[PDB]
Amino acid sequence: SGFRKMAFPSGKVEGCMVQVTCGTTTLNGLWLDDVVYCPRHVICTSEDMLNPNYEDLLIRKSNHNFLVQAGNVQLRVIGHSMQNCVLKLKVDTANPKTPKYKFVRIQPGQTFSVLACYNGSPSGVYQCAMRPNFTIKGSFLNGSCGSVGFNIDYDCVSFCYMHHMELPTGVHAGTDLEGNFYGPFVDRQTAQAAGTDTTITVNVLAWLYAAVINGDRWFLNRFTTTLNDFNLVAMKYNYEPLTQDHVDILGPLSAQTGIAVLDMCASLKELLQNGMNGRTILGSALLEDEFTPFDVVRQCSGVTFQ
Amino acid sequence: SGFRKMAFPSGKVEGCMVQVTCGTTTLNGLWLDDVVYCPRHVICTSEDMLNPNYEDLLIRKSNHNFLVQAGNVQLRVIGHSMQNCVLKLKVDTANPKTPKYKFVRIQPGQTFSVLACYNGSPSGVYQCAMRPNFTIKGSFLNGSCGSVGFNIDYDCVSFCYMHHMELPTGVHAGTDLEGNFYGPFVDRQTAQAAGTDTTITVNVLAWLYAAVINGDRWFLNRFTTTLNDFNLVAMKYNYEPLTQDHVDILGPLSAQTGIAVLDMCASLKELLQNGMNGRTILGSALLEDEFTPFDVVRQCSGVTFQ
């Protein structure tokens, strides 16, 4: 028993992280087969970032302007191309540590692990969620750009996030591994608005089911409610509306605990309207939304990977 | 910027985890050089756990009674030995993945990462603190025994914990890698009292400095206090007393932020007596005590490892 915000084991990803240097700028890249992936702004100076013309900047760079280092091995760069906001550097050596991998674009509300890196070397791993407004609330310092987010499925690493920048508000924005930003952001140093952010309701419900499984039951109430009645309340507190698809995904947790989804919703509605009044749930004084239904099932059934 | 409960990258430990089955009992072991370390209660049935005589039980077990397995590699057990509460199963093959490592016994209030494993296969990684009462609040299901806790000292893995049991109260107990329990616990299925748990005050202060580094300043106040007046309030709220050694440890954070340690303590005094009244610190509505002063420095300065 017990319940923790758990990250995926990072070993398969650690063997893919390299250091990419172009001119003065150094950041992290991801080396899979014979291609290194990194944020295109590796080719920018600090002044360039205010207003970069990436095509004009890239034309002034040749294959030998890129220093790629995997530990104490330099890799030789044999071609380079820009794909949206990522650079693809073809190198002469295929990574012998390349795991089975996929590139995936995740949806808001999904969770993933981030391996925070500096100079191509790992610093730490943590779990977070893609917010409904397409930002993430990470922990990133200068030089962490190119750090990647990932999930693991048995033997397969699914890469879903590459870090590109910190907004003036202190939240983080990045791309999938095809170089397309999550959200309306662009890779330039200018004020950029994120959307209003909302709480991920299906995740909160999953977490309440985790709490029941672990013995926290005090919030279970007599009442019930309807989907429209609940969504009317959730919108008043900036919660995402719940759909039938969300109810379907919660089915297994309903079966395991014997608590119908709409009953669990009526408990939540009362927590929203009256608060927690100094009590806690799974050790927390706030309603938690960074666990998906699949995360709860994984942690409560003990799933493992290759 | 940002602050997350970050674990150490787990890659160096993942290549050391094996499955150890003895009779019907299956748990995790740790394979370093040609020795597999695992909880000695792997030799017990569920009935044996009520009242085991480990020396008599171990006598009736031979080398061929231990099935050791690492992916699809069978290991041949050459010898066996019991060191306190750990079983040392010595094998014919030395682990080619053996990292640079050390065994260390940690002190209460120190933090480490746990690599949660089932059947010798890594499931997830999370950071926790050794509580002042020598339990950990982990996340562990049946068959997670033998999962290990560790820190990374630059190039060296420091192993400090191996999981042995879940107490009737849902908290977790285990040993160092020499087999000596942390706390007053024994490896048998009987009710065992953990001490009163206290909040790790030096860690709370470190996290308040993290909050200042990251822009949360609202709790900073006008006042100051003596180490006695503070320790007097702290004991009222089941906080660990603060010593001069703790003040010394916090020096670098004081210097970085320009806030004297005693001034931070005066801030903490006020939060305890008047609560937080519905606002948060670093996204949390409770005072956090699972970051050490060194964890904060690591995360706020971007330390990496081999």
Tab-separated table of C-alpha atoms in Angstrom, chain B:
chain	number	residue	atom	x	y	z
B	1	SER	CA	12.808	27.981	-12.381
B	2	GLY	CA	10.221	25.711	-10.791
B	3	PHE	CA	10.625	23.085	-8.061
B	4	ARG	CA	9.707	19.410	-8.203
B	5	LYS	CA	10.236	16.398	-5.968
B	6	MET	CA	12.983	14.966	-8.163
B	7	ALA	CA	14.394	11.432	-8.027
B	8	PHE	CA	17.893	10.363	-9.005
B	9	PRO	CA	18.194	8.835	-12.489
B	10	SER	CA	17.801	5.138	-11.972
B	11	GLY	CA	19.756	3.675	-14.893
B	12	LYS	CA	22.735	2.406	-12.895
B	13	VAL	CA	20.474	0.574	-10.458
B	14	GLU	CA	18.124	-0.950	-13.036
B	15	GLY	CA	20.895	-3.182	-14.343
B	16	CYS	CA	21.397	-4.661	-10.870
B	17	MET	CA	17.873	-5.861	-10.098
B	18	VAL	CA	17.157	-9.586	-10.251
B	19	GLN	CA	14.320	-11.905	-9.320
B	20	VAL	CA	14.895	-14.354	-6.455
B	21	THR	CA	12.448	-17.203	-5.935
B	22	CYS	CA	12.745	-19.735	-3.140
B	23	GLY	CA	9.977	-22.265	-2.963
B	24	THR	CA	6.754	-20.365	-3.486
B	25	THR	CA	8.155	-16.957	-2.436
B	26	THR	CA	9.345	-14.470	-5.065
B	27	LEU	CA	11.004	-11.139	-4.392
B	28	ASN	CA	13.674	-8.774	-5.673
B	29	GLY	CA	17.394	-9.047	-5.165
B	30	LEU	CA	20.362	-6.798	-5.862
B	31	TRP	CA	23.169	-8.265	-7.997
B	32	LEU	CA	26.572	-6.678	-7.467
B	33	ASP	CA	29.745	-8.482	-8.600
B	34	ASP	CA	28.968	-12.203	-8.069
B	35	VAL	CA	26.622	-11.771	-5.050
B	36	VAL	CA	22.850	-11.291	-4.907
B	37	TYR	CA	21.531	-9.503	-1.796
B	38	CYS	CA	17.909	-10.029	-0.760
B	39	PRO	CA	15.697	-10.061	2.360
B	40	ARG	CA	16.245	-13.263	4.279
B	41	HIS	CA	12.496	-13.807	4.656
B	42	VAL	CA	12.540	-15.079	1.067
B	43	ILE	CA	13.062	-18.491	2.729
B	44	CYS	CA	9.760	-18.202	4.661
B	45	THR	CA	6.295	-19.326	3.667
B	46	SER	CA	3.403	-17.097	4.777
B	47	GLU	CA	2.963	-19.310	7.838
B	48	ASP	CA	6.662	-19.187	8.703
B	49	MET	CA	6.426	-15.353	8.981
B	50	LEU	CA	4.334	-15.465	12.148
B	51	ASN	CA	7.296	-16.824	14.053
B	52	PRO	CA	10.374	-17.672	12.003
B	53	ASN	CA	13.535	-19.280	13.348
B	54	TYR	CA	15.731	-18.146	10.492
B	55	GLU	CA	18.776	-20.249	11.402
B	56	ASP	CA	16.748	-23.463	11.528
B	57	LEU	CA	14.890	-22.507	8.327
B	58	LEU	CA	18.123	-21.671	6.491
B	59	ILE	CA	19.684	-25.027	7.435
B	60	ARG	CA	17.032	-26.922	5.442
B	61	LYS	CA	17.721	-24.811	2.328
B	62	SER	CA	20.554	-25.642	-0.121
B	63	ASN	CA	22.110	-23.697	-3.057
B	64	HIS	CA	19.697	-25.349	-5.568
B	65	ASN	CA	16.695	-24.095	-3.516
B	66	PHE	CA	17.351	-20.576	-4.864
B	67	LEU	CA	16.156	-19.650	-8.377
B	68	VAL	CA	17.933	-16.443	-9.370
B	69	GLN	CA	17.028	-14.778	-12.626
B	70	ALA	CA	17.852	-11.566	-14.496
B	71	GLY	CA	15.703	-11.137	-17.578
B	72	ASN	CA	16.367	-14.488	-19.265
B	73	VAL	CA	19.725	-15.205	-17.659
B	74	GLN	CA	19.626	-17.975	-15.064
B	75	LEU	CA	22.201	-17.526	-12.338
B	76	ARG	CA	23.797	-20.512	-10.616
B	77	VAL	CA	24.014	-20.134	-6.826
B	78	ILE	CA	27.491	-21.161	-5.636
B	79	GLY	CA	27.122	-20.259	-1.961
B	80	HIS	CA	24.773	-18.750	0.557
B	81	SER	CA	25.124	-16.915	3.821
B	82	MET	CA	22.994	-14.842	6.165
B	83	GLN	CA	24.259	-11.458	7.319
B	84	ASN	CA	21.855	-10.090	9.933
B	85	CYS	CA	18.533	-9.784	8.081
B	86	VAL	CA	19.877	-10.094	4.517
B	87	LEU	CA	20.622	-13.244	2.588
B	88	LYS	CA	23.802	-13.221	0.479
B	89	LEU	CA	23.334	-15.586	-2.484
B	90	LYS	CA	26.699	-15.886	-4.196
B	91	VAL	CA	26.554	-16.770	-7.908
B	92	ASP	CA	28.982	-17.952	-10.589
B	93	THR	CA	28.606	-14.970	-12.951
B	94	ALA	CA	29.701	-11.490	-11.916
B	95	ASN	CA	27.324	-8.751	-13.021
B	96	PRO	CA	28.947	-7.010	-16.036
B	97	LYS	CA	26.750	-3.988	-15.201
B	98	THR	CA	28.113	-3.608	-11.707
B	99	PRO	CA	28.445	0.146	-11.089
B	100	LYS	CA	30.857	1.887	-8.826
B	101	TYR	CA	29.017	1.540	-5.519
B	102	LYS	CA	29.110	1.951	-1.749
B	103	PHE	CA	26.899	0.702	1.101
B	104	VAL	CA	25.873	3.465	3.480
B	105	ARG	CA	23.662	3.665	6.560
B	106	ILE	CA	21.699	6.919	6.464
B	107	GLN	CA	20.348	9.079	9.296
B	108	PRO	CA	16.708	10.049	9.882
B	109	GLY	CA	15.707	13.094	7.873
B	110	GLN	CA	17.940	12.181	4.918
B	111	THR	CA	16.348	11.576	1.522
B	112	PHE	CA	16.897	8.947	-1.139
B	113	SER	CA	15.279	7.502	-4.260
B	114	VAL	CA	13.470	4.151	-4.270
B	115	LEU	CA	13.400	1.995	-7.392
B	116	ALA	CA	10.170	0.035	-6.910
B	117	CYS	CA	10.485	-3.405	-8.511
B	118	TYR	CA	8.271	-6.493	-9.005
B	119	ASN	CA	9.709	-9.871	-10.145
B	120	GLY	CA	13.106	-8.261	-10.567
B	121	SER	CA	11.645	-5.756	-13.040
B	122	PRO	CA	11.673	-1.975	-12.373
B	123	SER	CA	8.252	-0.356	-12.079
B	124	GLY	CA	8.907	3.285	-11.100
B	125	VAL	CA	11.160	5.611	-9.144
B	126	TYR	CA	10.310	8.130	-6.411
B	127	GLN	CA	12.066	10.250	-3.775
B	128	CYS	CA	11.278	9.939	-0.060
B	129	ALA	CA	12.710	10.803	3.341
B	130	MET	CA	13.655	8.478	6.181
B	131	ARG	CA	11.191	9.566	8.876
B	132	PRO	CA	12.490	10.500	12.385
B	133	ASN	CA	10.815	7.265	13.557
B	134	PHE	CA	12.746	5.129	10.986
B	135	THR	CA	9.805	4.275	8.746
B	136	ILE	CA	9.293	5.434	5.205
B	137	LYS	CA	6.010	6.372	3.610
B	138	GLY	CA	6.510	4.540	0.367
B	139	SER	CA	4.384	2.866	-2.275
B	140	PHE	CA	4.870	-0.902	-2.150
B	141	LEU	CA	2.719	-3.902	-3.120
B	142	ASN	CA	3.190	-7.592	-2.384
B	143	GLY	CA	6.401	-8.785	-3.969
B	144	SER	CA	8.123	-5.408	-3.874
B	145	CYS	CA	10.372	-6.647	-1.030
B	146	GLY	CA	14.036	-6.329	-1.884
B	147	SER	CA	13.451	-3.039	-3.772
B	148	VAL	CA	16.312	-0.687	-2.845
B	149	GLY	CA	16.841	2.971	-2.002
B	150	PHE	CA	19.902	4.863	-3.176
B	151	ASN	CA	21.675	8.162	-3.726
B	152	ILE	CA	24.110	9.017	-6.545
B	153	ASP	CA	27.456	10.550	-5.399
B	154	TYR	CA	28.766	11.834	-8.795
B	155	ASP	CA	29.917	8.519	-10.298
B	156	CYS	CA	29.163	6.286	-7.297
B	157	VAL	CA	25.843	4.651	-6.358
B	158	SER	CA	25.325	4.740	-2.582
B	159	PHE	CA	22.868	2.025	-1.582
B	160	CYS	CA	21.188	2.875	1.700
B	161	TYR	CA	17.893	0.966	2.027
B	162	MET	CA	16.354	-2.364	1.190
B	163	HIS	CA	12.634	-2.879	1.676
B	164	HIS	CA	11.569	-5.736	3.962
B	165	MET	CA	7.998	-5.246	5.175
B	166	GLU	CA	4.793	-3.292	5.430
B	167	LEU	CA	3.555	-2.704	8.944
B	168	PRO	CA	-0.113	-3.256	9.886
B	169	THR	CA	-0.406	0.538	9.797
B	170	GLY	CA	0.555	0.791	6.095
B	171	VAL	CA	4.032	2.298	6.546
B	172	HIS	CA	7.237	0.633	5.466
B	173	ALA	CA	10.343	-0.703	7.164
B	174	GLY	CA	13.607	-2.079	5.934
B	175	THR	CA	17.324	-2.420	6.451
B	176	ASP	CA	20.643	-1.081	5.306
B	177	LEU	CA	22.532	-3.331	2.885
B	178	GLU	CA	24.368	-5.041	5.764
B	179	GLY	CA	20.985	-6.277	6.989
B	180	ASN	CA	20.540	-4.068	10.077
B	181	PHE	CA	17.020	-2.706	10.377
B	182	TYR	CA	16.342	0.951	10.573
B	183	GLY	CA	14.374	1.469	13.769
B	184	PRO	CA	13.111	-1.052	16.299
B	185	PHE	CA	11.594	-3.437	13.796
B	186	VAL	CA	12.066	-7.174	13.248
B	187	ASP	CA	11.298	-9.277	10.180
B	188	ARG	CA	8.328	-11.185	11.487
B	189	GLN	CA	4.576	-10.794	10.965
B	190	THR	CA	3.515	-9.339	14.322
B	191	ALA	CA	2.187	-5.963	15.415
B	192	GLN	CA	5.097	-3.556	15.861
B	193	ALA	CA	4.862	-0.019	17.213
B	194	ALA	CA	6.580	2.787	15.347
B	195	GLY	CA	7.520	5.812	17.438
B	196	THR	CA	5.646	9.087	17.276
B	197	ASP	CA	6.679	10.749	14.048
B	198	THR	CA	7.904	14.350	13.989
B	199	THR	CA	8.345	16.912	11.210
B	200	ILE	CA	11.926	17.386	9.964
B	201	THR	CA	12.441	21.056	10.766
B	202	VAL	CA	15.751	21.633	8.963
B	203	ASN	CA	14.133	20.218	5.779
B	204	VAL	CA	11.104	22.534	6.110
B	205	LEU	CA	13.471	25.485	6.371
B	206	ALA	CA	15.375	24.355	3.269
B	207	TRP	CA	12.088	24.249	1.327
B	208	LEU	CA	11.147	27.749	2.493
B	209	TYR	CA	14.465	28.942	1.001
B	210	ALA	CA	13.573	27.075	-2.213
B	211	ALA	CA	10.282	28.983	-2.165
B	212	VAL	CA	12.101	32.332	-1.885
B	213	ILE	CA	14.533	31.418	-4.697
B	214	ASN	CA	11.466	30.701	-6.859
B	215	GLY	CA	9.432	33.842	-6.084
B	216	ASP	CA	7.168	32.902	-3.137
B	217	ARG	CA	7.949	35.596	-0.522
B	218	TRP	CA	4.598	36.252	1.240
B	219	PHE	CA	5.538	34.399	4.460
B	220	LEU	CA	8.649	36.524	5.060
B	221	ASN	CA	8.022	38.753	8.037
B	222	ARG	CA	9.363	41.538	10.204
B	223	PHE	CA	10.239	39.528	13.287
B	224	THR	CA	13.126	37.419	14.464
B	225	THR	CA	13.626	34.855	17.217
B	226	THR	CA	16.131	32.960	19.308
B	227	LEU	CA	16.913	29.277	18.868
B	228	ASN	CA	15.222	28.596	22.278
B	229	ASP	CA	12.054	30.550	21.619
B	230	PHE	CA	11.740	28.783	18.300
B	231	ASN	CA	12.469	25.293	19.649
B	232	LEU	CA	9.829	25.970	22.317
B	233	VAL	CA	7.142	26.569	19.701
B	234	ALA	CA	8.462	23.758	17.482
B	235	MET	CA	8.003	21.127	20.193
B	236	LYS	CA	4.415	22.308	20.611
B	237	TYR	CA	3.706	21.248	17.021
B	238	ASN	CA	5.748	17.998	16.971
B	239	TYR	CA	8.645	19.547	15.053
B	240	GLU	CA	12.191	18.330	15.543
B	241	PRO	CA	14.311	20.781	17.567
B	242	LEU	CA	16.864	22.809	15.618
B	243	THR	CA	20.560	22.624	16.549
B	244	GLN	CA	23.484	24.839	15.602
B	245	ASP	CA	24.632	22.080	13.234
B	246	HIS	CA	21.346	22.636	11.358
B	247	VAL	CA	21.945	26.367	11.251
B	248	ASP	CA	25.410	25.749	9.835
B	249	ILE	CA	24.034	23.416	7.131
B	250	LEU	CA	21.680	26.152	5.965
B	251	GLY	CA	24.426	28.810	5.674
B	252	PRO	CA	24.796	28.633	1.881
B	253	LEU	CA	21.069	29.118	1.346
B	254	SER	CA	21.081	32.069	3.757
B	255	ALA	CA	23.970	33.585	1.780
B	256	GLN	CA	22.321	33.095	-1.630
B	257	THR	CA	19.043	34.712	-0.542
B	258	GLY	CA	20.168	37.322	1.979
B	259	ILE	CA	17.798	35.912	4.619
B	260	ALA	CA	19.407	34.925	7.883
B	261	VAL	CA	18.609	31.445	9.190
B	262	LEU	CA	17.092	32.786	12.407
B	263	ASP	CA	14.941	35.179	10.374
B	264	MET	CA	13.594	32.255	8.337
B	265	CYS	CA	12.864	30.490	11.666
B	266	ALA	CA	10.809	33.496	12.821
B	267	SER	CA	8.843	33.129	9.563
B	268	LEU	CA	8.327	29.441	10.261
B	269	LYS	CA	7.166	30.248	13.843
B	270	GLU	CA	4.351	32.376	12.440
B	271	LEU	CA	3.157	29.831	9.875
B	272	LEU	CA	2.855	27.205	12.593
B	273	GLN	CA	0.770	29.351	14.964
B	274	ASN	CA	-1.522	30.983	12.393
B	275	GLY	CA	-1.509	28.382	9.633
B	276	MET	CA	-1.416	29.269	5.952
B	277	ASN	CA	-5.065	30.353	5.517
B	278	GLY	CA	-5.862	28.972	2.125
B	279	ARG	CA	-2.829	30.123	0.208
B	280	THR	CA	0.077	27.923	-0.898
B	281	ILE	CA	3.887	27.737	-0.964
B	282	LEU	CA	5.478	26.204	-4.092
B	283	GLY	CA	2.073	24.800	-5.027
B	284	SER	CA	1.521	23.072	-1.665
B	285	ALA	CA	-1.013	23.759	1.098
B	286	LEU	CA	1.066	21.927	3.747
B	287	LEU	CA	4.606	22.478	4.968
B	288	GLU	CA	6.915	20.091	3.107
B	289	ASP	CA	9.720	18.218	4.863
B	290	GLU	CA	11.126	15.798	2.242
B	291	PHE	CA	13.806	18.109	0.810
B	292	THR	CA	17.186	18.325	2.533
B	293	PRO	CA	19.308	21.476	2.319
B	294	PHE	CA	21.525	19.591	-0.149
B	295	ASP	CA	18.524	18.563	-2.298
B	296	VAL	CA	17.535	22.229	-2.645
B	297	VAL	CA	21.081	23.259	-3.624
B	298	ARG	CA	21.326	20.367	-6.128
B	299	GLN	CA	18.044	21.250	-7.787
B	300	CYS	CA	18.598	25.028	-7.727
B	301	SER	CA	22.132	24.742	-9.195
B	302	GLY	CA	21.680	21.922	-11.728
B	303	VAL	CA	24.117	19.273	-10.472
B	304	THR	CA	24.543	16.293	-12.851
B	305	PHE	CA	26.071	12.799	-12.500
B	306	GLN	CA	28.336	10.389	-14.408
